[PDB]
Design a protein around this ligand. Structure first.
Ligand SMILES: Cc1cc2nc3c(=O)[nH]c(=O)nc-3n(C[C@H](O)[C@H](O)[C@H](O)COP(=O)(O)OP(=O)(O)OC[C@H]3O[C@@H](n4cnc5c(N)ncnc54)[C@H](O)[C@@H]3O)c2cc1C
Ligand SMILES: COc1ccc(-c2c(-c3ccc(C#N)c(F)c3)nc(N3CCC(N)CC3)n(C)c2=O)cc1F
Lengths: 125, 651
């Protein structure tokens, strides 16, 4: 097999000899494919460099208890019509109820906060 | 005993095809007797070799064997005779003990007092045959040819003994195999580079061998493939794979910056979708705290939805940073720009000139498949030079012998009855000579056998099969400039040093300088396509380019005008018509074997018994395994002398 760091496919030999200039056809149409891909690189760098501008500033100017208030219960139900089953969201919104206490409430009331009826509403996204 | 078999190019432990045919007794017989044969052989050779300055008679051989060996003494004799016939013992120059056969048997005309000739002549004379050599030159030795003025001494043909390790061969000198190069301007080549390229050269060659054997790329367009063609193909394929790398890299840069793009998008369309939410939240947060639960929700909802999308964007913002250094790395790991520089491909061109030198032809011409068929048989040992001039050997071999100098053979006539050689005086063309003989040994160079309108007619003509081999195999060229000076201005620790030519087309031109000799002499080799062109370029111009080259390398004022100059023109020399044989594309080494098969004339009267062969060939161009050397000649000679004695004195 070829000495280390020489490259010789059955294929490539047939292909650089198949006529009397396949020789320097093949070398050039790579030379040319090379400049194409360098030009694509400059274009996609300019494009990218614009969006880094649009991102200038970042988003800098843009930032418990187990007794349920009635305030809290109503925040829950509403969170349900707008978060279905995302107990982490519902808990984030209610402010002061672990992700369990949500899941519990979610059953304890279930019947009399029409929670099934609420969730078939949330179906419709 | 067994490293005397090697010193005789024989296996110590097996009998050879030769031995088989002269001793079918022993080799078809029991393994025990073979060992006895092989001992007696190896020992007789050792004995000869231990003191080859004097004849080893059947007598002395028997005296210095022991044990159960001088038991069987027809065997010691049958062997000793076989060795002396095939020129393995009592060859070259030896003090005879039993002086020469009183009166001689058979008459041989040898054409050429080159080494192949002299070697055969001595053998044939030693076997009591009437030998006369016809030489066109005013000297012996042929392509062994030594210039000699004052204490100046320089070989214009053979100057090396490429090994003593089983070589049938006067003051030999090791070659300091350390060779500095010197680009066109005069600048040495950093050892850094010299090594890069020598390795690339070495790899490029193995590459052609692979390209030949494994990939079977030996034809292309009906025409067969030169080492040249293969090397270019390999070098192109290397250039191509430079670019194939260049691409796949600058391409895995784009793929990476179309991930940065796709993401810088998500990250812009979040800045926006987050601006909205933060408005919408400020707004809902106006409606102030004594508020109903549908608007405390609308505040809280937003506040959640907004620290969600703020995390999400920070998550996309470390991703931004990875993809951005990942890219800044690749932007500073460019793969190799080029396969080889220009200064590089120019030093490669010199490593190729060194190849064009040894093989004495353009690589355009060498068989890819077969240029190196002789390679398994290179001798062992230091490659040496002859300090005192190689001429010493032909001359030494010539004394004793009937050599007609200034005798150019014009026609060779061979018939069932015998042969006549028609020759003339080179100093008057007009004066004619007719040598009648039992057999003719032709040691005419392949150059001469090839002369397009013949220098020498064979009557009758050599058969198709012979002339076809002569046409097929290559006869190359390699010339020298002898530079004689008053003072040793080069580095005397250094045997040889290169000059790198500007172009490919000129890699041969005074590409390499040798310091070999007692006197202040430098040899300048012209190889490759150069060798051929420079022959048609005035002596003065050539010595010009030499001094130019030398002044650039050594300092424009350390380099005197030369006392004496010589310049070989071997292709133009009509007794040589070149330097030596090479296996051309579409030849093989089989041709070396055809070149050596002797010719047997048709019968004189029809329906008469099958003749005896008459026309025999030796010379450099007739020995498959040692072409293009002195030893190979020397052997071809000893060989023919055997084949002829086996016929005209019986086997
Ligand atoms: C420049 C050069 C460098 C070489 N370097 C080396 C080296 O370093 N080491 C090495 O081992 N080998 C070397 N060789 C090879 C070596 O010189 C030859 O292989 C060998 O000397 C030739 O042996 P030969 O007897 O076959 O040929 P030749 O010496 O050619 O003998 C043939 C003879 O025939 C004569 N002749 C030609 N036409 C006629 C005619 N019509 N009638 C009569 N006589 C005729 C010629 O003048 C010549 O004497 C070199 C060869 C050359 C040219
Ligand atoms: C260090 O310098 C050396 C340079 C060259 C060889 C060498 C030679 C050769 C050829 C021409 C000359 C001359 N002049 C020479 F001196 C040697 N000729 C041959 N050939 C042998 C095989 C044949 N096909 C062609 C000659 N080879 C292989 C060699 O290695 C050996 C060395 F030691």
């Amino acid at each position: 097999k070829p000495p280390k760091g020489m490259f010789l496919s059955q294929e490539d030999v047939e292909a650089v000899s198949a006529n009397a200039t396949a020789a320097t056809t093949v070398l050039r149409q790579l030379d040319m494919e090379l400049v194409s891909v360098k030009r694509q690189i400059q274009n996609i760098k300019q494009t990218n460099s614009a969006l880094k501008e649009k991102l200038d500033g970042g988003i800098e100017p843009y930032r418990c208890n187990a007794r349920w208030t009635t305030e809290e219960q109503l925040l829950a139900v509403q969170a349900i019509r707008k978060y279905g089953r995302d107990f982490q969201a519902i808990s984030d919104v209610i402010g002061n109820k672990s992700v369990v206490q949500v899941k519990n409430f979610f059953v304890n009331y279930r019947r009399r906060f029409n929670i099934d009826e609420v969730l078939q509403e949330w179906e419709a996204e | 005993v067994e490293g005397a078999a090697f010193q005789s190019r024989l296996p110590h432990d097996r009998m050879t095809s030769q031995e088989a045919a002269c001793f079918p007794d022993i080799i078809s017989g029991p393994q025990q007797t073979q060992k006895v044969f092989l001992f007696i052989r190896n020992r007789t050779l050792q004995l000869w070799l231990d003191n080859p300055k004097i004849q080893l008679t059947f007598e002395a051989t028997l005296q210095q064997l022991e044990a159960p060996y001088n038991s069987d003494t027809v065997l010691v004799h049958r062997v000793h005779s076989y060795l002396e016939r095939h020129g393995l013992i009592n060859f070259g120059i030896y003090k005879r003990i039993k002086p020469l056969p009183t009166k001689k048997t058979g008459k041989v005309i040898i054409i050429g007092s080159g080494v192949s000739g002299l070697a055969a002549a001595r053998q044939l004379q030693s076997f009591g045959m009437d030998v006369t050599l016809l030489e066109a030159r005013d000297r012996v030795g042929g392509r062994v040819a030594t210039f000699r003025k004052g204490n100046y001494v320089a070989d214009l043909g053979a100057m090396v003994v490429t090994g003593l390790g089983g070589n049938p061969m006067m003051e030999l000198a090791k070659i300091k195999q350390k060779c500095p190069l010197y680009e066109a301007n005069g600048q040495a080549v950093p050892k850094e580079k010299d090594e890069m390229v020598e390795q690339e050269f070495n790899r490029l060659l193995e590459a052609t061998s692979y390209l030949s054997h494994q990939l079977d790329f030996n034809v292309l367009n009906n025409k067969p493939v030169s080492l040249g063609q293969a090397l270019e193909v390999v070098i192109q394929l290397q250039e191509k794979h430079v670019k194939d790398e260049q691409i796949e890299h600058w391409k895995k840069i784009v793929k990476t910056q179309e991930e940065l793009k796709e993401l810088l998008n998500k990250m812009v369309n979040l800045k926006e979708k987050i601006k909205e939410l933060h408005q919408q939240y400020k707004e809902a947060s106006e409606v102030k705290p004594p508020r109903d639960i549908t608007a405390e929700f609308l505040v809280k909802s937003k506040h959640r939805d907004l620290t969600a999308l703020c995390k999400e964007y920070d998550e996309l913002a470390e991703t931004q940073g990875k993809l951005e250094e990942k890219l800044q790395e690749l932007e500073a790991n460019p793969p190799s720009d080029v396969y080889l520089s220009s200064r590089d491909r120019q030093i490669l061109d010199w490593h190729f000139a060194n190849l064009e030198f040894a093989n004495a032809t353009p690589l355009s011409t060498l068989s890819l498949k077969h240029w190196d068929q002789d390679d398994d048989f290179e001798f062992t040992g230091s490659h040496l030079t002859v300090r005192n001039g190689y001429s010493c050997v032909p001359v030494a071999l010539a004394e004793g012998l009937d050599i007609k100098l200034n005798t150019a053979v014009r026609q060779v006539r061979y018939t069932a009855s015998g042969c006549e050689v028609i020759a003339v005086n080179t100093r008057s063309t007009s004066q004619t000579f007719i040598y009648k003989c039992d057999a003719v040994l032709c040691t005419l160079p392949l150059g001469v056998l090839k002369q397009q309108p013949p220098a020498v007619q064979f009557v009758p003509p050599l058969p198709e099969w012979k002339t076809s081999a002569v046409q097929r195999m290559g006869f190359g060229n390699l010339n020298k400039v002898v530079l004689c000076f008053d003072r040793v201005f080069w580095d005397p620790s250094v045997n040889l040093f290169g000059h790198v030519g500007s172009t490919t087309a000129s890699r041969g031109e005074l590409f390499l300088f040798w310091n070999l000799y007692k006197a202040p002499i430098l040899l300048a080799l012209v190889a490759g396509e150069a060798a051929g062109i420079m022959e048609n370029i005035s002596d003065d111009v050539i010595v010009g380019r030499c001094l130019a080259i030398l002044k650039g390398i050594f300092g424009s004022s350390a380099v005197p005008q030369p006392k004496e100059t010589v310049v070989s023109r071997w292709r133009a020399d009509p007794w040589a018509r070149g330097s030596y044989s090479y296996v051309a594309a579409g030849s093989s080494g089989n041709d070396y074997d055809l070149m050596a098969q002797p010719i047997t004339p048709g019968p004189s009267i029809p329906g008469a018994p099958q003749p005896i062969p008459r026309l025999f060939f030796a010379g450099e161009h007739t020995i498959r395994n040692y072409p293009a050397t002195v030893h190979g000649a020397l052997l071809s000679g000893l060989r023919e002398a055997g084949r002829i004695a086996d016929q005209f004195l019986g086997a």
